[PDB]
Design a protein around this ligand. Structure first.
Ligand SMILES: Cc1cc(C)c2c(c1)S(=O)(=O)NC(=O)N2
Ligand SMILES: Cc1cc(C)c2c(c1)S(=O)(=O)NC(=O)N2
Ligand SMILES: Cc1cc(C)c2c(c1)S(=O)(=O)NC(=O)N2
Ligand SMILES: [Zn+2]
Length: 257
């Protein structure tokens, strides 16, 4: 029932998911002059060399690439994190126009899209248990701006025609998510939530300062996806982002000066 339309979008979600008005909701605006450099934060460790992608799917709210998370093959460690977090999937949020689409903002700036690499804390054994814990998930958020093409994204873009409508999936093996990362791993971090229902407050957010650049043709292909299913009235999948939420009693920490 929930979505991004006028009658079921973010301003409605609290009725089914009252945690939408909770104390650690995401996304947030990152005020760069208020975030504090924390020298105790460790460098991020992104170990994706053994990643095993499985499928790509249109779930009616975004498209997602899934990974085999039954072993420590693609893990995130370090930074603000204690322990080992396994990569489960990645997906994007994007706009109808290049000036909007990201969920997090930086000094109120909206990027054209935002990539979420979703990882779960192995001490909880499975992702369903992890989402019930305040430190269960670590999502690596990466901004996209429009400029030069991102070669490591092209394989994703070229298969989207095969998952145009909700419920469609396709084989997506041998995809290397390292090709979606910027050069720098400098980041901001804060405790937050999933950005769609059920809005569970289980996420350590790690948002990279350096955006990746994608081409206008690449983001245009995101915008040709459909929220609807096959044989239904076509509604383009655009503006699948939640706006910034109240920071409340949180501090955003920076890994860099
Ligand atoms: C009619 C309509 C318009 C928009 C933007 C929608 C939906 C329907 S929707 O498909 O019900 N789900 C969604 O996310 N956005
Ligand atoms: C535990 C869990 C719950 C929900 C609603 C999820 C996922 C995991 S998920 O697999 O990360 N992808 C998704 O779209 N919804
Ligand atoms: C685990 C998970 C589940 C869902 C539905 C999510 C996310 C993570 S997410 O990365 O916060 N972004 C989003 O829109 N939905
Ligand atoms: Zn997301």
């Amino acid at each position: 029932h929930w979505g991004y339309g006028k009658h079921n979008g973010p301003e409605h979600w609290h009725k089914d998911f009252p945690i939408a008005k909770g104390e650690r909701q995401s996304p947030v605006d990152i005020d760069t002059h208020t975030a504090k450099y924390d020298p105790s934060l460790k460098p991020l460790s992104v170990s994706y060399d053994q990643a095993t992608s499985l499928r790509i799917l249109n779930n009616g709210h975004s498209f997602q690439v899934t990974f085999d998370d039954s072993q420590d093959k693609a893990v995130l460690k370090g930074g603000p994190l204690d322990g080992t977090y396994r990569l489960l999937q990645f997906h994007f949020h994007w706009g109808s126009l290049d000036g909007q689409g990201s969920e997090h903002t930086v000094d109120k700036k909206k990027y054209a899209a935002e990539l979420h690499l979703v990882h779960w804390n192995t001490k909880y054994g499975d992702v369903g248990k992890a989402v019930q814990q305040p430190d269960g998930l670590a999502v690596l958020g990466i901004f996209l701006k429009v400029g030069s093409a991102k070669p490591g994204l092209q394989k994703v873009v070229d298969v989207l025609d095969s998952i145009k409508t909700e419920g469609k999936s396709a084989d997506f093996t041998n995809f290397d998510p390292r090709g979606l990362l910027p050069e720098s791993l400098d980041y901001w971090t804060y405790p937050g939530s999933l950005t769609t229902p059920p809005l569970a407050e289980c996420v350590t957010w790690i948002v990279l300062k350096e955006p990746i650049s994608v081409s206008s043709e690449q983001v245009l292909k995101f915008r040709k996806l459909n929220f609807n299913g096959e044989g239904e009235p076509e509604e383009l999948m655009v503006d699948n982002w939640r706006p910034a939420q109240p920071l409340k009693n949180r501090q955003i920490k920076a890994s860099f000066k």
